[PDB]
Amino acid sequence: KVFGRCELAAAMKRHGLDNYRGYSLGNWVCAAKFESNFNTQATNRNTDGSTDYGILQINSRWWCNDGRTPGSRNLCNIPCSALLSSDITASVNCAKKIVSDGNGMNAWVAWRNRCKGTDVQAWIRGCRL
Ligand SMILES: [Cl-]
Ligand code: NA
Ligand code: NA
């Protein structure tokens, strides 16, 4: 599913990401934009052999099992394919564990390089939230 911007902002709020670990909703929408282009089916291989999955590009190196990332962890206790659903529940639940692990949103390379320190409130402008 390719979410609209305000559609994703509304789903992310419904699921408790607005101000989660102190990150406003616009940070999460900006991260999803530059990680996945709002596409739940996005997958991208990493140089170490892991893959990133879904709207927030969650890495099989630590967070999910994809059956082909040796010596990796599954800290969200899920198959990586769960993170590709039209239902973002599994991605949001797992993202809450990631952002809580001490690194905050710096875990998301696209967030650090493209959203951090910008006017992220712009990502929720015009949405009826
Ligand atoms: Cl933090
Ligand atoms: Na894994
Ligand atoms: Na999907």
Short mmCIF file of N, CA, C and O and ligand atoms in Angstrom, two decimals:
data_model
loop_
_atom_site.label_atom_id
_atom_site.label_comp_id
_atom_site.label_asym_id
_atom_site.label_seq_id
_atom_site.Cartn_x
_atom_site.Cartn_y
_atom_site.Cartn_z
N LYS A 1 0.86 -1.20 0.00
CA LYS A 1 0.00 0.00 0.00
C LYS A 1 0.88 1.24 0.00
O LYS A 1 1.85 1.27 0.81
N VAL A 2 0.59 2.19 -0.86
CA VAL A 2 1.28 3.49 -0.89
C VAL A 2 0.34 4.46 -0.16
O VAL A 2 -0.75 4.78 -0.69
N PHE A 3 0.68 4.83 1.06
CA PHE A 3 -0.10 5.78 1.88
C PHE A 3 0.03 7.15 1.28
O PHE A 3 1.04 7.58 0.79
N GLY A 4 -1.07 7.91 1.41
CA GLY A 4 -0.99 9.38 1.34
C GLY A 4 -0.29 9.95 2.57
O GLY A 4 -0.34 9.35 3.62
N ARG A 5 0.21 11.15 2.46
CA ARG A 5 0.94 11.78 3.57
C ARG A 5 0.04 11.92 4.80
O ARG A 5 0.36 11.47 5.87
N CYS A 6 -1.13 12.55 4.67
CA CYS A 6 -2.02 12.73 5.82
C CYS A 6 -2.65 11.43 6.27
O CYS A 6 -2.93 11.28 7.43
N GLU A 7 -2.91 10.50 5.36
CA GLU A 7 -3.39 9.17 5.71
C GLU A 7 -2.38 8.50 6.66
O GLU A 7 -2.75 7.93 7.65
N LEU A 8 -1.08 8.54 6.27
CA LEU A 8 -0.04 7.91 7.13
C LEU A 8 0.08 8.68 8.46
O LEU A 8 0.20 8.05 9.49
N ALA A 9 0.01 10.01 8.40
CA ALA A 9 0.10 10.80 9.64
C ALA A 9 -1.01 10.38 10.61
O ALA A 9 -0.77 10.17 11.77
N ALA A 10 -2.22 10.18 10.08
CA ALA A 10 -3.38 9.78 10.91
C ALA A 10 -3.19 8.37 11.45
O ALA A 10 -3.44 8.14 12.65
N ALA A 11 -2.69 7.41 10.64
CA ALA A 11 -2.48 6.04 11.12
C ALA A 11 -1.39 6.00 12.21
O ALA A 11 -1.49 5.30 13.22
N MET A 12 -0.32 6.76 11.95
CA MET A 12 0.80 6.83 12.93
C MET A 12 0.33 7.44 14.26
O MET A 12 0.71 6.96 15.34
N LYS A 13 -0.51 8.45 14.19
CA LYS A 13 -1.05 9.01 15.45
C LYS A 13 -1.99 8.00 16.15
O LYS A 13 -1.85 7.77 17.39
N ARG A 14 -2.89 7.40 15.38
CA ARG A 14 -3.81 6.38 15.95
C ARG A 14 -3.00 5.36 16.75
O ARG A 14 -3.49 4.87 17.78
N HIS A 15 -1.80 5.02 16.27
CA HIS A 15 -0.97 3.94 16.84
C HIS A 15 0.04 4.45 17.88
O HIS A 15 0.90 3.63 18.32
N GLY A 16 -0.04 5.72 18.25
CA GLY A 16 0.70 6.26 19.40
C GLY A 16 2.11 6.72 19.07
O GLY A 16 2.90 6.77 20.05
N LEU A 17 2.44 7.07 17.81
CA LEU A 17 3.81 7.60 17.53
C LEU A 17 3.91 9.10 17.76
O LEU A 17 5.08 9.57 17.92
N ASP A 18 2.84 9.90 17.82
CA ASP A 18 3.02 11.37 18.00
C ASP A 18 3.62 11.59 19.40
O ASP A 18 3.00 11.21 20.42
N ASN A 19 4.83 12.12 19.47
CA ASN A 19 5.60 12.39 20.71
C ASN A 19 6.12 11.12 21.36
O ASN A 19 6.52 11.20 22.54
N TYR A 20 6.14 10.00 20.67
CA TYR A 20 6.68 8.78 21.25
C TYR A 20 8.19 8.98 21.44
O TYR A 20 8.89 9.44 20.47
N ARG A 21 8.67 8.74 22.66
CA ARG A 21 10.06 9.03 23.11
C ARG A 21 10.42 10.47 22.73
O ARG A 21 11.62 10.75 22.50
N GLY A 22 9.44 11.37 22.72
CA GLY A 22 9.64 12.78 22.46
C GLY A 22 9.76 13.23 21.00
O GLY A 22 10.00 14.40 20.73
N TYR A 23 9.52 12.34 20.04
CA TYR A 23 9.57 12.68 18.60
C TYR A 23 8.18 13.00 18.08
O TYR A 23 7.28 12.12 18.04
N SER A 24 8.02 14.24 17.68
CA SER A 24 6.72 14.70 17.12
C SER A 24 6.35 13.88 15.89
O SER A 24 7.24 13.40 15.15
N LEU A 25 5.06 13.89 15.56
CA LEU A 25 4.50 13.14 14.41
C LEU A 25 5.25 13.51 13.13
O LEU A 25 5.50 12.61 12.30
N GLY A 26 5.56 14.75 12.90
CA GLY A 26 6.21 15.15 11.65
C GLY A 26 7.56 14.44 11.46
O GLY A 26 7.98 14.21 10.32
N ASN A 27 8.26 14.14 12.54
CA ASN A 27 9.55 13.42 12.42
C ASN A 27 9.27 12.02 11.82
O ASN A 27 10.08 11.55 11.00
N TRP A 28 8.23 11.35 12.29
CA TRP A 28 7.90 9.98 11.82
C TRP A 28 7.43 10.02 10.36
O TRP A 28 7.75 9.08 9.59
N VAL A 29 6.64 11.01 9.99
CA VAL A 29 6.16 11.10 8.61
C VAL A 29 7.35 11.39 7.69
O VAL A 29 7.45 10.77 6.59
N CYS A 30 8.22 12.33 8.07
CA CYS A 30 9.42 12.66 7.30
C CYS A 30 10.30 11.40 7.17
O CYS A 30 10.77 11.09 6.06
N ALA A 31 10.48 10.65 8.22
CA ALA A 31 11.29 9.44 8.16
C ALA A 31 10.68 8.49 7.14
O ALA A 31 11.40 7.89 6.31
N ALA A 32 9.39 8.23 7.21
CA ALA A 32 8.73 7.28 6.28
C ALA A 32 8.86 7.79 4.87
O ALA A 32 9.06 6.95 3.97
N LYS A 33 8.71 9.07 4.62
CA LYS A 33 8.82 9.60 3.27
C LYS A 33 10.17 9.21 2.68
O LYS A 33 10.25 8.66 1.54
N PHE A 34 11.25 9.51 3.40
CA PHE A 34 12.61 9.32 2.84
C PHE A 34 13.10 7.89 3.01
O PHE A 34 13.96 7.50 2.24
N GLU A 35 12.50 7.09 3.82
CA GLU A 35 12.86 5.65 3.93
C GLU A 35 12.15 4.85 2.85
O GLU A 35 12.79 3.94 2.24
N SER A 36 10.87 5.07 2.64
CA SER A 36 10.04 4.14 1.83
C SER A 36 9.21 4.85 0.78
O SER A 36 8.45 4.16 0.04
N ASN A 37 9.19 6.18 0.77
CA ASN A 37 8.23 6.93 -0.09
C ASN A 37 6.81 6.53 0.31
O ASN A 37 5.92 6.51 -0.56
N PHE A 38 6.54 6.23 1.56
CA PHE A 38 5.22 5.90 2.10
C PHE A 38 4.67 4.56 1.57
O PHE A 38 3.48 4.25 1.70
N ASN A 39 5.56 3.68 1.10
CA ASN A 39 5.19 2.38 0.48
C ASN A 39 5.44 1.25 1.47
O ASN A 39 6.62 0.97 1.79
N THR A 40 4.39 0.60 1.94
CA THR A 40 4.53 -0.50 2.90
C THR A 40 5.33 -1.69 2.31
O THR A 40 5.84 -2.45 3.08
N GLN A 41 5.38 -1.80 0.99
CA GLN A 41 6.04 -2.98 0.34
C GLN A 41 7.51 -2.73 0.09
O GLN A 41 8.14 -3.67 -0.39
N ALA A 42 8.08 -1.58 0.44
CA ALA A 42 9.49 -1.27 0.14
C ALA A 42 10.44 -2.26 0.83
O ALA A 42 10.31 -2.53 2.00
N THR A 43 11.41 -2.76 0.06
CA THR A 43 12.49 -3.62 0.59
C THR A 43 13.78 -3.14 -0.04
O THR A 43 13.79 -2.83 -1.25
N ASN A 44 14.87 -3.15 0.73
CA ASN A 44 16.19 -2.75 0.23
C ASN A 44 17.29 -3.51 0.95
O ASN A 44 17.31 -3.57 2.17
N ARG A 45 18.14 -4.13 0.15
CA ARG A 45 19.27 -4.94 0.66
C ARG A 45 20.36 -4.02 1.21
O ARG A 45 20.70 -3.05 0.56
N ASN A 46 20.92 -4.36 2.34
CA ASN A 46 22.09 -3.67 2.93
C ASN A 46 23.37 -4.40 2.52
O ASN A 46 23.33 -5.60 2.22
N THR A 47 24.51 -3.71 2.60
CA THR A 47 25.83 -4.25 2.17
C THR A 47 26.23 -5.44 3.05
O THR A 47 27.00 -6.27 2.55
N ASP A 48 25.77 -5.51 4.29
CA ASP A 48 26.15 -6.61 5.21
C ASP A 48 25.33 -7.87 4.95
O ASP A 48 25.53 -8.84 5.70
N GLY A 49 24.36 -7.87 4.02
CA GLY A 49 23.55 -9.08 3.78
C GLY A 49 22.15 -9.02 4.38
O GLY A 49 21.26 -9.82 4.00
N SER A 50 21.93 -8.11 5.32
CA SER A 50 20.61 -7.83 5.88
C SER A 50 19.76 -7.08 4.84
O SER A 50 20.25 -6.66 3.82
N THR A 51 18.47 -6.93 5.14
CA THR A 51 17.50 -6.19 4.32
C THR A 51 16.69 -5.30 5.26
O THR A 51 16.39 -5.70 6.36
N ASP A 52 16.29 -4.18 4.68
CA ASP A 52 15.35 -3.26 5.36
C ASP A 52 13.95 -3.43 4.77
O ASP A 52 13.80 -3.49 3.54
N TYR A 53 12.97 -3.43 5.64
CA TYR A 53 11.58 -3.80 5.27
C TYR A 53 10.56 -2.74 5.67
O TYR A 53 10.52 -2.34 6.85
N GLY A 54 9.70 -2.39 4.75
CA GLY A 54 8.45 -1.68 5.03
C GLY A 54 8.59 -0.16 5.08
O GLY A 54 9.58 0.42 4.68
N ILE A 55 7.52 0.44 5.57
CA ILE A 55 7.35 1.91 5.56
C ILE A 55 8.46 2.62 6.34
O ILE A 55 8.82 3.74 6.00
N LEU A 56 9.01 1.96 7.37
CA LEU A 56 10.14 2.52 8.15
C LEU A 56 11.42 1.69 7.98
O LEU A 56 12.39 1.92 8.74
N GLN A 57 11.51 0.86 6.94
CA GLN A 57 12.81 0.26 6.54
C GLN A 57 13.49 -0.37 7.77
O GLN A 57 14.70 -0.10 7.98
N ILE A 58 12.81 -1.27 8.43
CA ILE A 58 13.33 -1.94 9.64
C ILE A 58 14.25 -3.08 9.21
O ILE A 58 13.92 -3.91 8.33
N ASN A 59 15.42 -3.12 9.83
CA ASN A 59 16.59 -3.94 9.42
C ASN A 59 16.52 -5.34 10.05
O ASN A 59 16.45 -5.46 11.27
N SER A 60 16.57 -6.37 9.21
CA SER A 60 16.67 -7.80 9.59
C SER A 60 17.98 -8.08 10.39
O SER A 60 18.05 -9.17 11.00
N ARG A 61 18.97 -7.20 10.37
CA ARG A 61 20.24 -7.39 11.16
C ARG A 61 19.88 -7.54 12.64
O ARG A 61 20.54 -8.30 13.32
N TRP A 62 18.88 -6.82 13.14
CA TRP A 62 18.52 -6.78 14.58
C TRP A 62 17.07 -7.10 14.87
O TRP A 62 16.76 -7.61 15.96
N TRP A 63 16.11 -6.76 13.99
CA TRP A 63 14.74 -6.53 14.47
C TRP A 63 13.70 -7.57 14.02
O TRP A 63 12.66 -7.69 14.59
N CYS A 64 13.97 -8.28 12.93
CA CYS A 64 13.01 -9.25 12.33
C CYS A 64 13.78 -10.41 11.68
O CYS A 64 14.93 -10.26 11.41
N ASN A 65 13.09 -11.54 11.51
CA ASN A 65 13.70 -12.70 10.83
C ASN A 65 13.18 -12.80 9.39
O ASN A 65 12.00 -12.91 9.20
N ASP A 66 14.11 -12.78 8.46
CA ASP A 66 13.78 -12.95 7.02
C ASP A 66 14.30 -14.27 6.43
O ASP A 66 14.20 -14.43 5.20
N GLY A 67 14.86 -15.12 7.27
CA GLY A 67 15.39 -16.43 6.85
C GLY A 67 16.67 -16.34 6.08
O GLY A 67 17.14 -17.43 5.60
N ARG A 68 17.27 -15.17 5.87
CA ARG A 68 18.53 -15.11 5.08
C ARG A 68 19.51 -14.05 5.61
O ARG A 68 20.38 -13.59 4.83
N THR A 69 19.43 -13.74 6.90
CA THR A 69 20.41 -12.83 7.54
C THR A 69 21.10 -13.58 8.68
O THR A 69 20.65 -13.58 9.80
N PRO A 70 22.16 -14.37 8.37
CA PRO A 70 22.86 -15.16 9.39
C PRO A 70 23.41 -14.37 10.57
O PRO A 70 23.87 -13.26 10.37
N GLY A 71 23.33 -14.96 11.77
CA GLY A 71 23.91 -14.39 12.99
C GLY A 71 23.27 -13.07 13.34
O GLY A 71 23.94 -12.24 13.98
N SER A 72 22.03 -12.87 12.91
CA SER A 72 21.24 -11.65 13.19
C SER A 72 20.31 -11.90 14.38
O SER A 72 20.13 -13.06 14.80
N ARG A 73 19.73 -10.85 14.92
CA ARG A 73 18.72 -10.94 15.98
C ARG A 73 17.33 -10.71 15.37
O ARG A 73 17.23 -10.25 14.20
N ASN A 74 16.30 -11.00 16.15
CA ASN A 74 14.87 -10.84 15.84
C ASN A 74 14.24 -10.18 17.07
O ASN A 74 13.38 -10.79 17.72
N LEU A 75 14.61 -8.93 17.36
CA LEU A 75 14.24 -8.31 18.66
C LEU A 75 12.76 -7.93 18.68
O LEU A 75 12.19 -7.81 19.78
N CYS A 76 12.09 -7.78 17.52
CA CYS A 76 10.65 -7.50 17.46
C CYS A 76 9.86 -8.81 17.41
O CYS A 76 8.66 -8.76 17.42
N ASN A 77 10.58 -9.93 17.39
CA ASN A 77 9.97 -11.28 17.37
C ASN A 77 8.91 -11.40 16.28
O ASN A 77 7.77 -11.75 16.55
N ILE A 78 9.31 -11.12 15.04
CA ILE A 78 8.36 -11.16 13.90
C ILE A 78 9.11 -11.60 12.66
O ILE A 78 10.28 -11.28 12.48
N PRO A 79 8.40 -12.23 11.69
CA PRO A 79 8.94 -12.35 10.35
C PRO A 79 9.01 -10.96 9.70
O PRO A 79 8.07 -10.17 9.83
N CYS A 80 10.06 -10.72 8.93
CA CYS A 80 10.21 -9.40 8.27
C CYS A 80 9.03 -9.13 7.35
O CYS A 80 8.64 -7.97 7.17
N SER A 81 8.44 -10.17 6.74
CA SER A 81 7.27 -10.01 5.86
C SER A 81 6.07 -9.36 6.59
O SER A 81 5.30 -8.65 5.93
N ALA A 82 5.95 -9.49 7.91
CA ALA A 82 4.92 -8.77 8.71
C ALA A 82 5.03 -7.26 8.52
O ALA A 82 4.04 -6.50 8.70
N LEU A 83 6.25 -6.81 8.25
CA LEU A 83 6.48 -5.36 8.16
C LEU A 83 6.09 -4.81 6.79
O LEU A 83 6.30 -3.64 6.55
N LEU A 84 5.56 -5.64 5.87
CA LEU A 84 5.18 -5.21 4.50
C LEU A 84 3.66 -5.05 4.33
O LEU A 84 3.25 -4.57 3.23
N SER A 85 2.89 -5.40 5.36
CA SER A 85 1.42 -5.43 5.32
C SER A 85 0.88 -4.04 5.01
O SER A 85 1.61 -3.04 5.19
N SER A 86 -0.37 -3.93 4.58
CA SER A 86 -1.09 -2.64 4.49
C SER A 86 -1.38 -2.13 5.91
O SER A 86 -1.58 -0.93 6.10
N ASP A 87 -1.41 -3.02 6.89
CA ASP A 87 -1.66 -2.65 8.30
C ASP A 87 -0.30 -2.29 8.90
O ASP A 87 0.51 -3.25 9.04
N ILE A 88 -0.06 -1.02 9.28
CA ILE A 88 1.29 -0.61 9.79
C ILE A 88 1.47 -1.01 11.25
O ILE A 88 2.53 -0.64 11.80
N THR A 89 0.54 -1.70 11.91
CA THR A 89 0.65 -2.03 13.34
C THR A 89 2.02 -2.66 13.65
O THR A 89 2.70 -2.21 14.61
N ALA A 90 2.45 -3.67 12.93
CA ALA A 90 3.71 -4.38 13.26
C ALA A 90 4.89 -3.42 13.08
O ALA A 90 5.80 -3.47 13.94
N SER A 91 4.88 -2.59 12.04
CA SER A 91 5.99 -1.63 11.83
C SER A 91 6.04 -0.64 12.99
O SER A 91 7.15 -0.31 13.46
N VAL A 92 4.89 -0.12 13.39
CA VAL A 92 4.86 0.87 14.49
C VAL A 92 5.31 0.24 15.80
O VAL A 92 6.15 0.86 16.51
N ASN A 93 4.79 -0.93 16.14
CA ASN A 93 5.20 -1.60 17.41
C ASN A 93 6.70 -1.81 17.39
O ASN A 93 7.38 -1.66 18.45
N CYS A 94 7.24 -2.28 16.29
CA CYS A 94 8.69 -2.54 16.23
C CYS A 94 9.46 -1.21 16.27
O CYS A 94 10.44 -1.12 17.02
N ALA A 95 9.02 -0.19 15.54
CA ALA A 95 9.67 1.14 15.57
C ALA A 95 9.73 1.70 16.99
O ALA A 95 10.76 2.32 17.37
N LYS A 96 8.70 1.47 17.79
CA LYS A 96 8.73 1.93 19.21
C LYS A 96 9.87 1.26 19.99
O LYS A 96 10.57 1.94 20.82
N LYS A 97 10.14 -0.02 19.76
CA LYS A 97 11.30 -0.69 20.40
C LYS A 97 12.63 -0.10 19.89
O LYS A 97 13.62 0.06 20.66
N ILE A 98 12.72 0.13 18.59
CA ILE A 98 13.97 0.66 17.99
C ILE A 98 14.27 2.01 18.63
O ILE A 98 15.43 2.24 19.08
N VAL A 99 13.34 2.92 18.58
CA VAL A 99 13.59 4.33 19.00
C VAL A 99 13.88 4.41 20.50
O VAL A 99 14.48 5.40 20.94
N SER A 100 13.49 3.39 21.25
CA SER A 100 13.67 3.30 22.72
C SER A 100 15.02 2.71 23.08
O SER A 100 15.27 2.58 24.30
N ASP A 101 15.83 2.28 22.14
CA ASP A 101 17.02 1.44 22.44
C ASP A 101 18.24 2.27 22.84
O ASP A 101 19.29 1.62 23.08
N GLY A 102 18.11 3.61 22.92
CA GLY A 102 19.20 4.52 23.33
C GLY A 102 19.68 5.50 22.27
O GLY A 102 20.28 6.55 22.62
N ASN A 103 19.47 5.16 20.99
CA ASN A 103 19.93 5.92 19.80
C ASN A 103 18.83 6.86 19.28
O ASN A 103 19.11 7.69 18.41
N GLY A 104 17.62 6.74 19.80
CA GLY A 104 16.50 7.54 19.31
C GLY A 104 16.29 7.36 17.82
O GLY A 104 16.53 6.24 17.29
N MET A 105 15.91 8.40 17.14
CA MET A 105 15.61 8.28 15.69
C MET A 105 16.89 8.26 14.86
O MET A 105 16.77 8.02 13.64
N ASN A 106 18.08 8.42 15.44
CA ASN A 106 19.33 8.31 14.66
C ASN A 106 19.49 6.90 14.10
O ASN A 106 20.31 6.75 13.16
N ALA A 107 18.76 5.91 14.59
CA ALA A 107 18.75 4.56 13.98
C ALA A 107 18.35 4.63 12.49
O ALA A 107 18.82 3.78 11.67
N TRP A 108 17.50 5.57 12.10
CA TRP A 108 17.04 5.75 10.71
C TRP A 108 17.94 6.73 10.00
O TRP A 108 17.93 7.95 10.31
N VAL A 109 18.78 6.18 9.12
CA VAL A 109 19.79 6.98 8.38
C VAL A 109 19.07 8.12 7.64
O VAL A 109 19.59 9.24 7.66
N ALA A 110 17.96 7.84 6.99
CA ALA A 110 17.29 8.89 6.18
C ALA A 110 16.80 9.96 7.19
O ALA A 110 16.77 11.16 6.82
N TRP A 111 16.38 9.60 8.41
CA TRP A 111 15.92 10.63 9.38
C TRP A 111 17.09 11.53 9.77
O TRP A 111 16.99 12.77 9.72
N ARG A 112 18.22 10.93 10.12
CA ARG A 112 19.37 11.71 10.56
C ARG A 112 19.81 12.68 9.46
O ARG A 112 20.09 13.83 9.73
N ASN A 113 19.85 12.19 8.23
CA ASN A 113 20.44 12.98 7.12
C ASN A 113 19.43 13.90 6.46
O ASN A 113 19.92 14.86 5.81
N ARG A 114 18.13 13.67 6.61
CA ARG A 114 17.14 14.43 5.79
C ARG A 114 16.06 15.07 6.65
O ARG A 114 15.36 15.99 6.11
N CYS A 115 15.88 14.68 7.89
CA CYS A 115 14.76 15.20 8.69
C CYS A 115 15.26 15.91 9.94
O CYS A 115 14.71 16.98 10.31
N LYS A 116 16.25 15.35 10.61
CA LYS A 116 16.82 15.91 11.85
C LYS A 116 17.23 17.37 11.62
O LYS A 116 17.92 17.67 10.70
N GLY A 117 16.75 18.24 12.49
CA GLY A 117 17.13 19.66 12.45
C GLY A 117 16.36 20.45 11.41
O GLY A 117 16.66 21.66 11.30
N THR A 118 15.37 19.86 10.73
CA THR A 118 14.52 20.57 9.75
C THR A 118 13.16 20.86 10.37
O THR A 118 12.82 20.36 11.46
N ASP A 119 12.36 21.66 9.67
CA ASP A 119 10.99 22.00 10.10
C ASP A 119 10.05 20.84 9.78
O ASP A 119 9.29 20.92 8.80
N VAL A 120 10.01 19.82 10.62
CA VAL A 120 9.29 18.56 10.30
C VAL A 120 7.78 18.76 10.47
O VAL A 120 7.04 17.97 9.95
N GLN A 121 7.35 19.81 11.17
CA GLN A 121 5.91 20.13 11.30
C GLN A 121 5.30 20.31 9.90
O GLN A 121 4.12 19.99 9.70
N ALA A 122 6.09 20.70 8.93
CA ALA A 122 5.62 20.83 7.55
C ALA A 122 5.01 19.51 7.01
O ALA A 122 4.13 19.54 6.12
N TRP A 123 5.48 18.35 7.47
CA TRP A 123 5.00 17.04 6.98
C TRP A 123 3.56 16.77 7.40
O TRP A 123 2.97 15.87 6.80
N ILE A 124 3.05 17.46 8.41
CA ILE A 124 1.64 17.26 8.83
C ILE A 124 0.80 18.49 8.49
O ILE A 124 -0.40 18.48 8.88
N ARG A 125 1.28 19.41 7.68
CA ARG A 125 0.51 20.65 7.40
C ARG A 125 -0.72 20.25 6.59
O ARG A 125 -0.64 19.40 5.70
N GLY A 126 -1.87 20.85 6.94
CA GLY A 126 -3.11 20.64 6.21
C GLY A 126 -3.85 19.40 6.60
O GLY A 126 -5.01 19.30 6.23
N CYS A 127 -3.25 18.44 7.31
CA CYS A 127 -3.91 17.19 7.74
C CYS A 127 -4.89 17.45 8.87
O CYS A 127 -4.57 18.20 9.81
N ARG A 128 -5.99 16.70 8.87
CA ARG A 128 -7.06 16.84 9.88
C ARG A 128 -6.86 15.75 10.94
O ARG A 128 -7.45 14.64 10.78
N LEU A 129 -6.08 16.06 11.97
CA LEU A 129 -5.49 15.07 12.91
C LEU A 129 -6.17 15.17 14.27
O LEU A 129 -6.06 14.18 15.01
CL CL B 1 16.10 10.06 21.75
NA NA B 2 17.15 -11.07 11.97
NA NA B 3 1.48 -3.84 1.57
#
